[PDB]
Nucleic acid binder design. Sequence first.
DNA 1: GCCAACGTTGGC
DNA 2: GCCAACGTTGGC
Length: 71
Amino acid sequence: MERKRWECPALPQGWEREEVPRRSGLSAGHRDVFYYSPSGKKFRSKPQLARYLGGSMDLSTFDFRTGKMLM
DNA sequence: GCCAACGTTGGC
DNA sequence: GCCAACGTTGGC
């Protein structure tokens, strides 16, 4: 239950991935996953991410929750 | 007025 | 029953 954020190598240069554990309520302990662009914009779902990156790379096998390409 | 934080819901 | 995707809002 600590927040983690650094470079995601499945994405282009300067994109970062973050995990935030929820501290309270019914879903306490669940880890939300976010991505940050080089410009600092925050993404919270894959369709949202694919609107930015989907032109400039293939995202069909990118697993948003794990941050890796499924092979 | 935003947005981090948690809940709701549809699709499987 | 699970969870991807996002709706909603208290606290700022």
